């Protein structure tokens, strides 16, 4: 009436919960790159010679 | 005399200072695929990675 060893298991199942990968879009930056410093339009000379 | 010994952090670098629970992490790592230090790694202990979490070895995520 006691507990005895039974037949060895024939296989093992290991369960884990996993989600999946999306598409590669690689959206690097809101406003991207190093935007260049640049000329103010027209500007004009702010200096003249004497005479 | 202090060269190379007294450094300074970059502008974006920062020190971590918050303290969190980190108690539901060992139970999540097992859902993800880790097998507890207790047993049944499912491979050979050589094709398995020893998982550690803050000094405490959760144990042997498969390779």
GROMACS .gro file of C-alpha atoms in nm:
model
  114
    1UNK     CA    1   0.000   0.000   0.000
    2UNK     CA    2   0.300   0.226  -0.013
    3UNK     CA    3   0.450   0.440  -0.294
    4UNK     CA    4   0.690   0.265  -0.536
    5UNK     CA    5   0.919   0.400  -0.814
    6UNK     CA    6   0.733   0.383  -1.151
    7UNK     CA    7   0.864   0.377  -1.507
    8UNK     CA    8   1.116   0.638  -1.606
    9UNK     CA    9   0.973   0.925  -1.799
   10UNK     CA   10   1.016   0.894  -2.178
   11UNK     CA   11   1.041   1.269  -2.236
   12UNK     CA   12   1.054   1.616  -2.086
   13UNK     CA   13   0.861   1.929  -2.178
   14UNK     CA   14   0.992   2.273  -2.071
   15UNK     CA   15   0.744   2.561  -2.118
   16UNK     CA   16   0.838   2.930  -2.130
   17UNK     CA   17   0.628   3.231  -2.256
   18UNK     CA   18   0.788   3.430  -2.543
   19UNK     CA   19   0.678   3.725  -2.768
   20UNK     CA   20   0.817   3.791  -3.126
   21UNK     CA   21   1.036   4.044  -3.323
   22UNK     CA   22   0.889   4.330  -3.532
   23UNK     CA   23   1.013   4.468  -3.865
   24UNK     CA   24   1.350   4.651  -3.870
   25UNK     CA   25   1.275   5.021  -3.925
   26UNK     CA   26   1.572   5.173  -3.738
   27UNK     CA   27   1.424   5.526  -3.684
   28UNK     CA   28   1.747   5.682  -3.551
   29UNK     CA   29   1.651   6.043  -3.455
   30UNK     CA   30   1.349   6.289  -3.430
   31UNK     CA   31   1.537   6.571  -3.611
   32UNK     CA   32   1.832   6.355  -3.737
   33UNK     CA   33   2.206   6.405  -3.820
   34UNK     CA   34   2.411   6.710  -3.711
   35UNK     CA   35   2.222   6.992  -3.898
   36UNK     CA   36   2.480   7.239  -4.039
   37UNK     CA   37   2.536   7.601  -3.919
   38UNK     CA   38   2.450   7.839  -4.207
   39UNK     CA   39   2.426   8.190  -4.368
   40UNK     CA   40   2.152   8.441  -4.255
   41UNK     CA   41   1.985   8.553  -4.585
   42UNK     CA   42   2.108   8.883  -4.742
   43UNK     CA   43   2.294   8.997  -4.422
   44UNK     CA   44   2.434   9.321  -4.586
   45UNK     CA   45   2.760   9.497  -4.482
   46UNK     CA   46   2.729   9.656  -4.132
   47UNK     CA   47   3.037   9.883  -4.179
   48UNK     CA   48   3.171  10.142  -4.427
   49UNK     CA   49   3.504  10.322  -4.490
   50UNK     CA   50   3.558  10.690  -4.409
   51UNK     CA   51   3.547  10.938  -4.702
   52UNK     CA   52   5.048   6.448  -1.057
   53UNK     CA   53   4.669   6.367  -1.061
   54UNK     CA   54   4.657   6.282  -1.437
   55UNK     CA   55   4.452   5.974  -1.532
   56UNK     CA   56   4.352   5.935  -1.166
   57UNK     CA   57   4.098   6.218  -1.132
   58UNK     CA   58   3.844   6.182  -1.414
   59UNK     CA   59   3.510   6.348  -1.482
   60UNK     CA   60   3.178   6.216  -1.605
   61UNK     CA   61   3.050   6.303  -1.949
   62UNK     CA   62   2.746   6.529  -1.968
   63UNK     CA   63   2.501   6.247  -2.046
   64UNK     CA   64   2.644   5.997  -1.797
   65UNK     CA   65   2.472   5.950  -1.463
   66UNK     CA   66   2.492   5.745  -1.145
   67UNK     CA   67   2.208   5.511  -1.053
   68UNK     CA   68   2.057   5.590  -0.713
   69UNK     CA   69   1.705   5.444  -0.702
   70UNK     CA   70   1.622   5.129  -0.508
   71UNK     CA   71   1.353   4.892  -0.632
   72UNK     CA   72   1.179   4.571  -0.529
   73UNK     CA   73   1.353   4.321  -0.761
   74UNK     CA   74   1.146   4.032  -0.626
   75UNK     CA   75   0.924   3.955  -0.925
   76UNK     CA   76   1.234   3.934  -1.148
   77UNK     CA   77   1.345   3.582  -1.045
   78UNK     CA   78   0.991   3.457  -1.114
   79UNK     CA   79   0.982   3.631  -1.454
   80UNK     CA   80   1.323   3.501  -1.564
   81UNK     CA   81   1.179   3.147  -1.523
   82UNK     CA   82   0.878   3.231  -1.749
   83UNK     CA   83   1.127   3.359  -2.006
   84UNK     CA   84   1.317   3.027  -2.023
   85UNK     CA   85   1.563   3.011  -1.727
   86UNK     CA   86   1.560   2.681  -1.521
   87UNK     CA   87   1.603   2.733  -1.142
   88UNK     CA   88   1.938   2.644  -0.971
   89UNK     CA   89   1.757   2.333  -0.833
   90UNK     CA   90   1.768   2.125  -1.153
   91UNK     CA   91   1.666   1.974  -1.490
   92UNK     CA   92   1.875   2.219  -1.699
   93UNK     CA   93   1.755   2.032  -2.018
   94UNK     CA   94   2.114   2.034  -2.158
   95UNK     CA   95   2.469   1.956  -2.033
   96UNK     CA   96   2.566   2.239  -1.795
   97UNK     CA   97   2.829   2.328  -2.056
   98UNK     CA   98   2.585   2.440  -2.327
   99UNK     CA   99   2.409   2.657  -2.067
  100UNK     CA  100   2.467   3.009  -1.937
  101UNK     CA  101   2.488   3.071  -1.561
  102UNK     CA  102   2.224   3.352  -1.493
  103UNK     CA  103   2.306   3.585  -1.199
  104UNK     CA  104   2.085   3.866  -1.064
  105UNK     CA  105   2.257   4.093  -0.807
  106UNK     CA  106   2.477   3.820  -0.646
  107UNK     CA  107   2.200   3.562  -0.646
  108UNK     CA  108   2.238   3.292  -0.911
  109UNK     CA  109   1.899   3.223  -1.063
  110UNK     CA  110   2.071   2.967  -1.282
  111UNK     CA  111   2.137   2.821  -1.623
  112UNK     CA  112   1.940   2.972  -1.904
  113UNK     CA  113   1.986   2.740  -2.200
  114UNK     CA  114   2.240   2.842  -2.463
   0.00000   0.00000   0.00000
